[PDB]
Design a protein around this ligand. Structure first.
Ligand code: ALF
Lengths: 979, 292
């Protein structure tokens, strides 16, 4: 697109446009039918039902689909081969189906991204102002406007569409939706450079033009305008899969791998063992219900919910549940200067007076050092700073503090007024004590401000005068030094430039201040001053000093960027401002460390070609958008790896996407913090997009996965620690609920390898995963940190589940739960009559209803009912034994490197969870009614004790290992048991 | 993509020495784990009476409700069914049932021939402690004898029935012809009245009654000849696991059974502290007999 470069006549003949009438109605209809979007096309969306439906299927739910169907078939076999079979497999069939839906509904709530960023562009451009088609101005609708159409923009009418500026005067617009900066930019009908985004010759779709009329022909309308492209590109963008989701999908793939492999194996050793179709069918619903954790994906969803509830109490709202953690696994965090790292409040920083430069306080809370008030040049300068025709506050915001009060004027005029108001306390007193009689407004070439003020003693006239320092250097003949008016000599001129260029060195926009005392004899009381033709001296004034203005950081920012870089997270500035201002803020906030110089700085010091300067020598980078435009992905990845403190400046909104996609090439998870419409693509493309809650635009909020309602950038550091904490706590919930799968599974594989009567029932299993072992698993979301993961796995560069966790859940700790469970099963069978010698080889007769007189080891004969009643009591006891050996499992999973006596049992939910674990088990096994479908029978008070010794063994074993692994650090023990 | 990396050891997870270390660690872990489990099982064992159950009678889940069981039993690998199949006549499949019935009744003839601790009990003679009451085979008549092929020869099979031996069980029998409940077959009520009119001692016993289950099985089963007493006696039952215990048996005798027609039978005991249920099969047994 080079239409801004080509002259007006060329574009007019390209589009058939006229500089005086633009187009006719028929040509307007033709352009509409050719293309009439003139708006952001709504995005393609998928309904909720299809997203939910595809969420009903997974690795843990597809298996429960096969399990649920199988018992439905099993119940059919029983019914047509036994017309009076009670309903046990059918209700179990329904139960497993409900688990699919409830877990298929917990997953949906985890991924419920509600970001209607297209509907967030509610502003757009309602009530289009004026169009010169048909030789008449029409206040027509917002969208009807098309290309080749002459528009009439005025003050604050949101330029209707991308127009090639044709004619205008005093035209200033604010493309704050393009580069984030809201400072007015003067537009003229002349292209200034090749890049169309930095020419005064071209307007844009989204600019709430401050002043200057303006005439332009519409180059394009929507979906091709600069704003139109971004909105379409922001809408048609997805981060992909969040880091925690990728780990969870990896977790599901691992467990489904064993479950489908084990069930496939046991469909072979079953059919080769003589099991009938029903016996294998009843068996299959055992080894695919014990294996799959029915209450694990739901557990993780609630665990993320709890920490999102806790982290929202720090004014940190979260839109996507899984986005809570990805601030912990992130390693490179892009940012924005104006609005995110700075207050977006142009304020004075440095003051030149009496050949001295001192820093001025910039904190919002005004906690800085006011050590300069005692300076001799302070009162005169602030008097000049206040009496220079000034600006004014607002009455309707008078009650707000001085910094929060709104003003009328330019940003430069605002900055001096707040500083004077803050310094003198109340400059209205100076207004009352110093009346105004004359003023000269800011022009477009001379742009000075001359005003006349009546002297307090009513003896003469005071002259106030500020402007660009170079312009008033020639207009000043004397300089105030230490309260003494000194004529301007060669030394002062060199000193003036030295401070002036030094002040511009930190990118701080500056303006000079000077005054003059009108003689009383030549200008007595009642003297009349002519503004059009000045009757007062204009040149050779008394120079006072230089004021500086720069957008300063917030209070929390310098600490946050320091701690983020300390936690392994590199920080990269990605702004849209000029490199000089970006480099000044980047060094100030802490992105560029002090004493670290880029190629330009190093070459500058060596006075040599920057090209010959070795890139390695330099550390930071100030890469400009133009340089970023013509380099490909090869060099881009090099500079992202070679340096560590890169500062990208003058970047178009589409270039931030290139940066984020560039960083993600290394395999890192990027985070973007922004405020404006320009960074919306970066917020949608990054793994986690953090926005601003007060100084942020509407689209930036709606296109972000997190909102900082308090604007405190220090909440990022807290989000990092809480993100890395919830990841570890989730891992400690996984290692706890995976230790129940082998004690649940072992009775089934002990039922087929050897011929033992079943120990655990399938219905009993559902009372563990969906029942007791939910609150303790939820409780681990409350566990506090131990030591620091800052150095170990800085951005949590590890898997959620690995071989060490499986070997410690399916291996060591898990087996000691199965042995503890079976010890109770052998105790009850042995005590009631069935000795272990008789038990092995009894599977065929135990289930069979043919034998009503199966004999135990003492010569008794049990019926089918008394046999099954005994088996169900062991089913209850195995359940409670699993629960009892789960008290120790929780306590030893509370910690991971430190011993329990060091950490201390100080987790309110966990202590309550242990009480909840026992009470549910006790209630579910000691109340009349639950032997009628849950197969749960009262237990003797002596049958809760057998699993207790195995509980103590697990606790003694784990704590013992912890001591060994905390000792002998890096020991193979830790190398193969530290999950 | 194999990514096997066998050249730099790396047997998919570790080097050879690392695998050796993890294997010896797992081996010892499981070894002392099995040692702990076996030690606990032995500790539990040393607190068991191998002659008397730890929980007896009503404390256990066996309860005070016994159940019957037909002896002939199906062949092994047919543990699901309760069907007795045979063809009457010289060229028949009677051999398995006859041999099984002979094997079951083996202790009632060999050890009873000596009877060192056996006691010739009777209704008015209580057993001596540590002595199992005798049960002579001749008490089962002549037709239920291995000599006449246990009746599986002429087409008149005879099936033994026995009570569950619940440890320490104390049967309570009806003390009058009016105490008996309803729902008892009229045949058993008439038998009870005859016993009460005759020797009053014989009424102290548990009463058996076999009948067809399905309404048609009532009339397709024919008459039944309980060759011994019509129900078990009441002077065997305080079981207490006496060595060489012989459970009393009531020998049915299906005199009239139609050829090639299945019959499902259900026999229930009749004592005051005995329940009966057609579904849980408490206090009753269910076997199916079909003759071809
Ligand atoms: F400061 Al910006 F996009 F808001 F560069």
């Amino acid at each position: 697109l080079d239409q801004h470069k080509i002259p007006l006549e060329e574009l007019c003949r390209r589009l058939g446009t006229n500089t005086e009438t633009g187009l006719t109605s028929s040509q307007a209809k033709s352009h509409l039918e050719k293309y009439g979007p003139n708006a952001l096309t709504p995005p393609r969306t998928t309904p909720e039902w299809i997203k939910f439906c595809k969420q009903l299927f997974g690795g843990f739910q597809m298996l429960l689909w096969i399990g649920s169907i199988l018992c439905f078939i099993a119940y059919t076999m029983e019914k047509y081969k036994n017309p009076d079979v009670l309903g046990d497999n059918l209700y179990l069939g329904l139960a497993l189906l409900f688990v699919v839906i409830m877990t298929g509904c917990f997953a949906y709530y985890q991924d419920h991204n509600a970001s209607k960023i297209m509907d967030s562009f509610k502003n757009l451009m309602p009530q289009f102002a004026f169009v010169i088609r048909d030789g008449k101005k029409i206040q027509l609708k917002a969208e009807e406007v098309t290309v080749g159409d002459l528009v009439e923009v005025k003050f604050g009418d949101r330029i209707p569409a991308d127009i090639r500026i044709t004619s205008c005067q005093s035209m200033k617009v604010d493309n704050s939706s393009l580069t984030g900066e809201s400072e007015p930019q003067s537009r003229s009908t002349e292209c200034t450079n090749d890049n169309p985004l930095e020419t005064k010759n071209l307007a844009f779709f989204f600019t709430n033009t401050l002043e200057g009329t303006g005439r332009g022909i519409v180059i394009n309308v929507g979906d091709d305008s600069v704003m139109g492209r971004i909105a379409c590109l922001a809408s048609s963008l997805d981060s992909g899969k969040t880091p925690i989701a990728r780990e969870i999908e990896h977790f599901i793939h691992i467990i489904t791998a064993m479950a489908v492999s084990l069930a496939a194996v046991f469909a072979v050793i079953s059919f080769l063992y003589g099991y009938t179709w029903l016996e294998a069918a009843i068996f299959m619903i055992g080894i695919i219900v014990a294996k799959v954790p029915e209450g694990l994906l739901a557990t993780v969803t609630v665990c993320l919910t709890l920490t999102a509830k806790r982290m929202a109490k720090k004014n940190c709202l979260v839109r996507n549940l899984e986005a809570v953690e990805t601030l912990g696994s992130t390693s490179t965090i892009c940012s924005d200067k104006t609005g995110t790292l700075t207050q977006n409040r142009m304020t004075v920083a440095h003051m030149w007076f009496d050949q001295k430069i001192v820093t001025a306080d910039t904190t919002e809370n005004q906690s800085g050092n006011q050590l300069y008030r005692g300076s001799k040049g302070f009162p005169e300068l602030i008097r000049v700073a206040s009496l220079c025709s000034r600006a004014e506050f607002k009455t309707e915001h008078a009650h707000l503090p001085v910094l929060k009060r709104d003003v009328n004027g330019d940003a430069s005029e605002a900055a001096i007024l707040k500083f004077a108001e803050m310094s003198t306390g109340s400059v209205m007193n100076i207004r009352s004590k110093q009346k105004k009689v004359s003023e000269i407004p800011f022009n477009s070439a001379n742009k000075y401000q001359v005003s006349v003020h009546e002297r307090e003693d009513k003896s003469g006239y005071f002259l106030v005068m500020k402007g660009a320092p170079e312009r008033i250097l020639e207009r000043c003949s004397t300089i105030l030094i230490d309260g003494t008016e000194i004529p301007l000599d060669n030394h002062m001129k060199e000193c003036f430039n030295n401070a002036y260029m030094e002040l511009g060195g930190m990118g701080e926009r500056v303006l000079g201040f000077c005054d003059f005392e009108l003689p009383s004899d030549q200008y007595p009381r009642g003297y009349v001053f002519d503004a059009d033709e000045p009757n007062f001296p204009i040149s050779g004034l008394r120079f006072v000093g230089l004021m500086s203005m720069i957008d300063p950081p917030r209070a929390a920012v310098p600490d946050a960027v320091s701690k983020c870089r300390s936690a392994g997270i590199k920080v990269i500035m990605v702004t849209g401002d000029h490199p000089i201002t970006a480099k000044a803020i980047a060094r100030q906030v802490g992105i560029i460390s002090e004493g670290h110089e880029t190629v330009d700085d190093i070459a500058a010091r060596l006075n040599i070609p920057v090209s010959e300067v070795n890139p390695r020598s330099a550390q930071a980078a100030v890469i400009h958008g133009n340089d970023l435009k013509d380099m490909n992905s090869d060099q881009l990845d090099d500079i992202l790896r070679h340096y560590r403190e890169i500062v990208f400046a003058r970047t178009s909104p589409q270039q931030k996407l290139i940066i984020v996609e560039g960083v993600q090439r290394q395999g890192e998870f990027v985070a973007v913090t922004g405020d404006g419409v320009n960074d919306s693509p970066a917020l949608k493309k990054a793994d986690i997009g953090v926005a601003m809650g007060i100084a942020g635009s509407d689209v930036s909020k709606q296109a972000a996965d997190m909102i900082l309602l308090d604007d405190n950038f220090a909440s990022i550091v807290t989000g990092v620690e809480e993100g890395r904490l919830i990841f570890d706590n989730i891992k400690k919930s996984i290692a706890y609920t995976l230790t129940s799968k082998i004690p649940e599974l072992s009775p089934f594989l002990m039922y087929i390898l050897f011929d033992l009567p079943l120990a655990i029932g399938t219905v009993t299993i559902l009372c563990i995963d969906l029942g007791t072992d939910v609150v303790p698993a939820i409780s681990m979301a409350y566990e506090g940190p131990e030591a620091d993961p800052r150095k170990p796995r800085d951005p949590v560069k590890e898997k959620l589940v690995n071989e060490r966790l499986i070997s410690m859940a399916y291996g060591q700790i898990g087996v000691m739960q199965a042995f503890g469970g079976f010890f109770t099963y052998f105790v009850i069978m042995g005590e009631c009559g069935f000795l272990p010698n008789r038990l092995f080889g009894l599977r065929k007769w135990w289930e069979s209803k043919a034998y009503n007189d199966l004999t135990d080891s003492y010569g008794q004969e049990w019926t089918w009912d008394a046999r099954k009643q005994l088996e169900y009591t062991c089913h209850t006891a195995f359940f409670i034994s699993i629960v009892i050996v789960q008290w120790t499992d929780l306590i030893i999973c509370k910690t991971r490197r430190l011993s329990l006596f060091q950490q201390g049992m100080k987790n309110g939910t966990l202590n309550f969870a242990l009480v909840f674990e026992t009470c549910v088990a006790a209630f579910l096994s000691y109340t009349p009614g639950m032997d009628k479908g849950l197969r749960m029978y009262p237990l003797k008070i002596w049958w809760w004790f057998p699993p207790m010794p195995f509980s103590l063994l697990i606790l003694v074993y784990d704590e013992c290992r912890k001591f060994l692994m905390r000792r002998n650090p890096g020991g193979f023990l830790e190398r193969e048991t530290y999950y | 993509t194999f990514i096997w990396n066998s050249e730099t050891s790396e047997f998919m997870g570790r080097t050879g020495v690392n695998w050796a270390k993890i294997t010896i660690f797992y081996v010892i872990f499981y070894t002392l784990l099995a040692g702990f489990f076996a030690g606990m099982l032995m500790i539990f064992y040393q607190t068991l009476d191998f002659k008397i159950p730890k929980w007896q009678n009503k404390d256990s889940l066996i309860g005070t409700n016994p159940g019957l069981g037909f002896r002939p039993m199906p062949p092994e690998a047919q543990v699901d069914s309760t069907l007795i199949q045979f063809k009457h006549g010289i060229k028949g499949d009677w051999q398995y049932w006859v041999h099984s019935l002979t094997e079951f009744l083996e202790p009632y003839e060999t050890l009873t021939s000596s009877g060192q601790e056996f006691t010739n009990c009777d209704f008015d003679k209580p057993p001596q402690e540590g002595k199992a009451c005798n049960f002579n085979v001749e008490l089962l008549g002549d037709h239920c004898t291995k000599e006449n092929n246990f009746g599986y020869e002429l087409g008149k099979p005879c099936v033994l029935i026995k009570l569950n031996k619940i440890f320490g069980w104390r049967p309570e029998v009806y003390n009058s012809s009016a105490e008996v409940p309803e729902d008892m077959p009229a045949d058993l009520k008439s038998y009870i009245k005859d016993i009460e009119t005759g020797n009053k001692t014989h009424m102290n016993m548990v009463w058996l009654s076999c009948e067809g289950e399905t309404a048609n099985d009532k009339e397709k089963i024919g008459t039944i000849t309980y060759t011994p007493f019509r129900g078990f006696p009441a002077y065997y039952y305080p079981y207490l696991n006496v060595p060489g215990y012989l459970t009393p048996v009531v020998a049915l005798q299906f005199g009239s059974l139609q050829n090639g027609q299945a019959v499902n039978v259900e026999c229930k005991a009749w004592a005051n502290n005995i329940s009966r249920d057609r579904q849980r099969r408490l206090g009753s047994v269910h076997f199916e007999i079909r003759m071809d």
